[PDB]
RNA sequence: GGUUGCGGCCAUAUCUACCAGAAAGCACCGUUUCCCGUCCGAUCAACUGUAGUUAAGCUGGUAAGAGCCUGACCGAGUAGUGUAGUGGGUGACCAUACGCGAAACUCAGGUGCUGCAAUCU
RNA sequence: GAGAACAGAAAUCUCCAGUAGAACAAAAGGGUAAAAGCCCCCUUGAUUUUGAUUUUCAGUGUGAAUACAAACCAUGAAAGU
């Protein structure tokens, strides 16, 4: 009389909201290494994430019925898919919604340089925790789609925005450094999935107070090519960028 | 005998479910540490009740699957003097002491934590598929961990010696318990009446004739020894992987190749149903 | 080969049905209590049949599950009074049988008509070394397809120890 | 061992989510695919960046708590922790404001008719001829006081009591279905 | 490496029949004061490997076994969807042609790998 | 179904088992299998203290309730719920 009512009042909105939930329903085409791809690449938002079992012959960017249906029905906001073809080979969907509708649909050509976490020496980790991000390049702020993919990761890998924090579970980071300069109207630089850590050491000039941080490369060292991009309404900005008050 | 649609649609349980080695339902209530205050590492406890083994460990949850950092055993007893009872209640309490001492020395405090301070730990327990009750060896081992130097959130309503009608902790019975009261009391209350059961139990202790007083001297000396040294230097592993696999690999079956198995099919088409 | 694999008894469950709830049920049941020691519980009549005298959640089933040396004794009595011979049927596909004795008066006590002296039915359970995988919650596992006693093995066992005979197959 | 890097465009921080953003320029092929020094070079650049991070993110205000074991929405004694500001960015929400506003034809009554909504004191009300406290509604209480006693001194009128109450709560339900349709 | 413990991913992972199970964890299975649990030592629990320990526990092969993954644009640049028109047009419309885009059957390949404390003659 | 002498087509005990059609204040694409599917124990919840909605003729250094947070609350050994 209250189970799917506690669940329902969770599913209901909030003012100072919770974390946002992800959705991974395989398309009509996958591969074993793609099973590996999903696990290793989304391997941090576990728990708060959704996976599926079967496949779909689907077109995401034309109509927006089916995955909207699935997401409304599973209470989530972060749709993902891996769409494959001969021409649009490896043109995956990393799309965020807004209010069970969709804000902007993003498809990245996922490059063929798949370097998994087992591609290097295994390490430890504190699972699920909230990561750090670094973003180098003025294109991360002057290139609209670089801004889009930036904020996409910034709201997917964001985690629970909680004031209190402790150095201990503050270990891991993404390194974002775009593949060089650009100009508008030409072939584009690509993004680098660069999962690294921050390891503490005396600076001999920072010493006890200021450490010296060293990162270790373990993977999964992946790359991202841009794909097909949407550009939603400005009323979307009116509803999306405000305050509860 | 199952059909085609049945077994071409149906679903499997989990692999670690196929065995009695994980209660994922509580693993999902633990992987949620709270989990909404803020980030702070996991310190969990794993106990398994196996014959001849006292398996008590402390894991780190990782994407590489797990890295159990802390571990306890039974074979490091001769250095503490008492060696028998690799399972019993004295064993539970003793290893609860010993894990405390080793993890103490491996933090390296007694005689990164950024500028403040020592920060003593709080290690919990994920119950596993052993049920939780009172009056047993599990919570005696918990007492051992506590009085060694762990700090576990719990109540004493579980400590053997706990009264649940009039909520009474019996410090006298617990003291007798600790110095060898219930076990050696069973020994003598069986021995004043019969020797066959008395002999069946304490298979060497019957031959060394150690009375409760002397095994409580063992208790004391071993307590002070645990507090002294968490040394725990393991086996040298004589006859390494090569010779271990000489044993474990001299009588193992390997794959029968496609040419051989197709020749077995050739047998099937020549003599079996190929008209004798 | 039989190094250790035998067919020891696990438990003897009685199966008594009543077409009424009252002093009759409780009379045969107090008889059960003096017989066993563990008070014969009440189990619900599943739901009404209306032809047999039963309704829903009535608590009309009373079964006792006997173990321990008392079990060997009650089986020796409950075959001796059966003349060490039972009927053709009741051999379970598991290696057991459920058979009944008319008028339990036939052994021991006197009648006392006003306490409950009726006909009863037993159902035995066996076991094989290796079959304790069901009982232990942990190590939840399987058994061999041939390592489990069946109808052939319960005919074998009705021939085997306790030296029982079958009354025309 | 160093602490200060050179940023020809000095970097920015956004700490509610533990982030830093640089607006410096990169040569086209400095980070390209065909590099076998891709690891060393890009990892050294972001190494300088995260050096900047950890030199920045340590002299902040904290929150020491003088309470000991048992801190419900908080900590034990032994630690001292670091806090987070709000990031200078508005990340995507999930909904509009979870609003619920209406009139339900009763709110207009509360306003125009000078009716202050009641104070909801409690439930266990005192019923004479009993000698006890029994709730206005909650244990066969002051609600059900006619389907209990033995004679009423006025077709049984008890069933009539119950059916009248059913008509009442149904009128409640009709005027609630209206309010939830509007 | 056997595996003890935890797993990561959840049928290559299970079910169907053997054989091997040579070391040690691994189990089967004997006892019952006090802690104890219920209708019961059925489960827990006081004892060691105790009495029985390879028959299940358990891995493997053994079997084109049943069921499941990958690839052959293999179908397939398929149909088709908006992209040129007084092309086609009495009508249920198909084209050239460009964005994109097959799917299944099909033809074969395979029926579990990693990490940390541990014991091996 | 194999079983199942009083008792059988529907009275009580095992087994293979239906991966469920487990049973859901359902309707779901789905979906919990040590379960939301039964019963055995435990208890009060309409607590109070503070910012936003307003708001009273002693327009009550916030009195009224709404939402949110804590503080306590019951449970459990326990992190938890």
GROMACS .gro file of N, CA, C and O in nm, chain C residues 20 23-28 30-31 103-105 109-119:
model
   92
  541UNK      N    1  -1.415  -3.301   1.115
  541UNK     CA    2  -1.474  -3.223   1.223
  541UNK      C    3  -1.362  -3.164   1.307
  541UNK      O    4  -1.253  -3.222   1.316
  544UNK      N    5  -1.326  -3.198   2.019
  544UNK     CA    6  -1.269  -3.286   2.120
  544UNK      C    7  -1.214  -3.414   2.058
  544UNK      O    8  -1.123  -3.474   2.115
  545UNK      N    9  -1.265  -3.455   1.943
  545UNK     CA   10  -1.208  -3.571   1.873
  545UNK      C   11  -1.066  -3.541   1.826
  545UNK      O   12  -0.973  -3.619   1.850
  546UNK      N   13  -1.051  -3.430   1.753
  546UNK     CA   14  -0.919  -3.384   1.712
  546UNK      C   15  -0.825  -3.376   1.831
  546UNK      O   16  -0.715  -3.433   1.829
  547UNK      N   17  -0.869  -3.309   1.937
  547UNK     CA   18  -0.783  -3.287   2.052
  547UNK      C   19  -0.757  -3.416   2.129
  547UNK      O   20  -0.652  -3.429   2.193
  548UNK      N   21  -0.849  -3.512   2.124
  548UNK     CA   22  -0.829  -3.639   2.193
  548UNK      C   23  -0.720  -3.721   2.126
  548UNK      O   24  -0.623  -3.762   2.190
  549UNK      N   25  -0.736  -3.745   1.995
  549UNK     CA   26  -0.628  -3.811   1.922
  549UNK      C   27  -0.498  -3.733   1.935
  549UNK      O   28  -0.390  -3.792   1.936
  551UNK      N   29  -0.393  -3.536   2.202
  551UNK     CA   30  -0.331  -3.559   2.332
  551UNK      C   31  -0.269  -3.699   2.337
  551UNK      O   32  -0.164  -3.720   2.399
  552UNK      N   33  -0.336  -3.795   2.273
  552UNK     CA   34  -0.272  -3.924   2.249
  552UNK      C   35  -0.139  -3.905   2.177
  552UNK      O   36  -0.037  -3.966   2.212
  624UNK      N   37  -0.645  -4.914   1.406
  624UNK     CA   38  -0.663  -4.939   1.549
  624UNK      C   39  -0.531  -4.952   1.625
  624UNK      O   40  -0.490  -5.063   1.661
  625UNK      N   41  -0.462  -4.840   1.646
  625UNK     CA   42  -0.336  -4.836   1.720
  625UNK      C   43  -0.343  -4.902   1.857
  625UNK      O   44  -0.241  -4.921   1.923
  626UNK      N   45  -0.464  -4.935   1.902
  626UNK     CA   46  -0.485  -5.007   2.027
  626UNK      C   47  -0.404  -5.136   2.029
  626UNK      O   48  -0.358  -5.180   2.134
  630UNK      N   49  -0.114  -5.003   2.522
  630UNK     CA   50  -0.212  -4.947   2.615
  630UNK      C   51  -0.347  -5.016   2.601
  630UNK      O   52  -0.370  -5.091   2.505
  631UNK      N   53  -0.435  -4.994   2.697
  631UNK     CA   54  -0.573  -5.041   2.689
  631UNK      C   55  -0.653  -4.945   2.601
  631UNK      O   56  -0.598  -4.860   2.532
  632UNK      N   57  -0.786  -4.961   2.602
  632UNK     CA   58  -0.870  -4.881   2.514
  632UNK      C   59  -0.903  -4.745   2.573
  632UNK      O   60  -0.859  -4.642   2.521
  633UNK      N   61  -0.979  -4.742   2.684
  633UNK     CA   62  -1.038  -4.618   2.732
  633UNK      C   63  -1.110  -4.547   2.617
  633UNK      O   64  -1.055  -4.454   2.557
  634UNK      N   65  -1.231  -4.589   2.582
  634UNK     CA   66  -1.298  -4.535   2.463
  634UNK      C   67  -1.304  -4.383   2.455
  634UNK      O   68  -1.318  -4.326   2.346
  635UNK      N   69  -1.295  -4.317   2.571
  635UNK     CA   70  -1.314  -4.173   2.583
  635UNK      C   71  -1.183  -4.095   2.584
  635UNK      O   72  -1.170  -3.998   2.660
  636UNK      N   73  -1.085  -4.138   2.505
  636UNK     CA   74  -0.962  -4.061   2.488
  636UNK      C   75  -0.919  -4.049   2.343
  636UNK      O   76  -0.840  -3.959   2.310
  637UNK      N   77  -0.967  -4.134   2.252
  637UNK     CA   78  -0.929  -4.130   2.112
  637UNK      C   79  -0.833  -4.240   2.074
  637UNK      O   80  -0.712  -4.227   2.093
  638UNK      N   81  -0.886  -4.349   2.019
  638UNK     CA   82  -0.809  -4.469   1.987
  638UNK      C   83  -0.847  -4.509   1.845
  638UNK      O   84  -0.941  -4.585   1.825
  639UNK      N   85  -0.772  -4.459   1.747
  639UNK     CA   86  -0.817  -4.472   1.609
  639UNK      C   87  -0.711  -4.530   1.516
  639UNK      O   88  -0.605  -4.575   1.562
  640UNK      N   89  -0.740  -4.532   1.386
  640UNK     CA   90  -0.644  -4.573   1.286
  640UNK      C   91  -0.556  -4.457   1.241
  640UNK      O   92  -0.598  -4.342   1.236
   0.00000   0.00000   0.00000
